[PDB]
Short mmCIF file of all heavy atoms in Angstrom, two decimals:
data_model
loop_
_atom_site.label_atom_id
_atom_site.label_comp_id
_atom_site.label_asym_id
_atom_site.label_seq_id
_atom_site.Cartn_x
_atom_site.Cartn_y
_atom_site.Cartn_z
N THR A 735 95.65 112.50 113.84
CA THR A 735 96.31 113.79 113.92
C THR A 735 96.56 114.41 112.55
O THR A 735 97.06 113.74 111.64
CB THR A 735 97.65 113.68 114.62
OG1 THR A 735 97.48 112.93 115.86
CG2 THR A 735 98.23 115.07 114.93
N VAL A 736 96.22 115.66 112.38
CA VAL A 736 96.38 116.37 111.13
C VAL A 736 97.11 117.70 111.31
O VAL A 736 96.59 118.59 111.98
CB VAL A 736 95.01 116.67 110.49
CG1 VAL A 736 95.17 117.51 109.20
CG2 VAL A 736 94.31 115.38 110.18
N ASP A 737 98.31 117.84 110.76
CA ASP A 737 99.08 119.05 110.88
C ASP A 737 99.68 119.47 109.50
O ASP A 737 100.72 120.13 109.45
CB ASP A 737 100.21 118.88 111.90
CG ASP A 737 101.32 117.91 111.46
OD1 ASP A 737 101.05 117.11 110.53
OD2 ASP A 737 102.39 117.96 112.05
N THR A 738 99.01 119.06 108.43
CA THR A 738 99.42 119.42 107.09
C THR A 738 98.22 119.82 106.22
O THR A 738 97.08 119.52 106.54
CB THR A 738 100.20 118.25 106.41
OG1 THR A 738 99.36 117.08 106.40
CG2 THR A 738 101.49 117.96 107.11
N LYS A 739 98.49 120.48 105.11
CA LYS A 739 97.51 120.73 104.07
C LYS A 739 96.42 121.73 104.44
O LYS A 739 96.24 122.77 103.76
CB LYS A 739 96.89 119.41 103.63
CG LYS A 739 96.10 119.50 102.32
CD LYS A 739 96.63 118.49 101.31
CE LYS A 739 95.99 118.71 99.94
NZ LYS A 739 96.08 117.53 99.07
N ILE A 740 95.67 121.43 105.50
CA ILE A 740 94.53 122.28 105.89
C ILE A 740 94.86 123.23 107.06
O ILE A 740 94.06 124.11 107.37
CB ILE A 740 93.31 121.42 106.32
CG1 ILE A 740 93.66 120.49 107.47
CG2 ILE A 740 92.81 120.62 105.12
CD1 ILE A 740 92.43 119.78 108.05
N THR A 741 96.01 123.04 107.71
CA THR A 741 96.35 123.83 108.89
C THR A 741 96.95 125.18 108.48
O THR A 741 96.82 125.59 107.33
CB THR A 741 97.34 123.03 109.75
OG1 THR A 741 98.36 122.44 108.93
CG2 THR A 741 96.64 121.94 110.53
N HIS A 742 97.58 125.87 109.43
CA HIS A 742 98.07 127.24 109.18
C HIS A 742 99.33 127.24 108.33
O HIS A 742 100.22 126.42 108.52
CB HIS A 742 98.32 127.93 110.51
CG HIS A 742 98.37 129.42 110.41
ND1 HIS A 742 99.44 130.10 109.86
CD2 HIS A 742 97.51 130.39 110.79
CE1 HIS A 742 99.23 131.40 109.88
NE2 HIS A 742 98.06 131.61 110.45
N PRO A 743 99.43 128.22 107.39
CA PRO A 743 100.59 128.26 106.48
C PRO A 743 101.94 128.55 107.09
O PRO A 743 102.95 128.08 106.52
CB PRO A 743 100.18 129.38 105.49
CG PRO A 743 99.16 130.17 106.20
CD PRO A 743 98.42 129.20 107.00
N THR A 744 101.99 129.27 108.21
CA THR A 744 103.28 129.62 108.81
C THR A 744 103.34 129.31 110.30
O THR A 744 104.45 129.19 110.85
CB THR A 744 103.56 131.17 108.62
OG1 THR A 744 102.50 131.92 109.23
CG2 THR A 744 103.69 131.51 107.14
N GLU A 745 102.21 129.18 110.94
CA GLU A 745 102.17 129.08 112.39
C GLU A 745 102.01 127.61 112.87
O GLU A 745 101.80 126.68 112.06
CB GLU A 745 101.03 129.92 112.97
CG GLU A 745 101.30 131.38 112.85
CD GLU A 745 100.14 132.24 113.33
OE1 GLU A 745 99.18 131.67 113.87
OE2 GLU A 745 100.22 133.50 113.19
N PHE A 746 102.12 127.43 114.17
CA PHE A 746 102.19 126.11 114.78
C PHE A 746 100.83 125.68 115.32
O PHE A 746 100.44 126.03 116.41
CB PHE A 746 103.23 126.14 115.92
CG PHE A 746 103.53 124.82 116.54
CD1 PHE A 746 103.03 123.62 116.04
CD2 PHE A 746 104.37 124.73 117.64
CE1 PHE A 746 103.34 122.40 116.61
CE2 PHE A 746 104.68 123.52 118.25
CZ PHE A 746 104.16 122.36 117.72
N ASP A 747 100.11 124.87 114.52
CA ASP A 747 98.80 124.36 114.92
C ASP A 747 98.51 122.97 114.33
O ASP A 747 99.09 122.59 113.31
CB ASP A 747 97.71 125.35 114.49
CG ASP A 747 97.43 125.27 113.00
OD1 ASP A 747 98.39 125.14 112.21
OD2 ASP A 747 96.24 125.35 112.61
N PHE A 748 97.62 122.26 114.98
CA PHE A 748 97.24 120.93 114.50
C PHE A 748 95.90 120.50 115.02
O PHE A 748 95.49 120.87 116.11
CB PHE A 748 98.32 119.90 114.90
CG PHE A 748 98.45 119.74 116.39
CD1 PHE A 748 97.76 118.73 117.07
CD2 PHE A 748 99.29 120.58 117.09
CE1 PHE A 748 97.93 118.57 118.42
CE2 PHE A 748 99.45 120.45 118.47
CZ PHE A 748 98.77 119.45 119.13
N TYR A 749 95.19 119.67 114.23
CA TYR A 749 93.98 119.01 114.68
C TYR A 749 94.35 117.68 115.32
O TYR A 749 95.19 116.96 114.84
CB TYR A 749 93.01 118.77 113.53
CG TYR A 749 92.43 120.03 112.93
CD1 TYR A 749 92.99 120.61 111.80
CD2 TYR A 749 91.31 120.62 113.49
CE1 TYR A 749 92.44 121.76 111.25
CE2 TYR A 749 90.76 121.77 112.95
CZ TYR A 749 91.33 122.34 111.85
OH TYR A 749 90.80 123.48 111.29
N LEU A 750 93.71 117.37 116.44
CA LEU A 750 93.92 116.10 117.13
C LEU A 750 92.56 115.58 117.67
O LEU A 750 92.08 116.08 118.66
CB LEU A 750 94.94 116.19 118.22
CG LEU A 750 95.10 114.95 119.10
CD1 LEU A 750 95.48 113.74 118.26
CD2 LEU A 750 96.14 115.18 120.18
N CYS A 751 92.03 114.55 117.05
CA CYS A 751 90.84 113.88 117.54
C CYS A 751 91.27 112.75 118.48
O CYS A 751 91.68 111.68 118.03
CB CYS A 751 89.99 113.34 116.41
SG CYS A 751 88.44 112.57 116.97
#
Side-chain angles (χ1 to χ4, degrees):
Chain A
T735 311
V736 176
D737 69 342
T738 56
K739 195 124 188 200
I740 59 171
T741 45
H742 198 287
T744 58
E745 291 177 5
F746 188 6
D747 76 320
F748 62 95
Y749 293 96
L750 173 58
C751 184

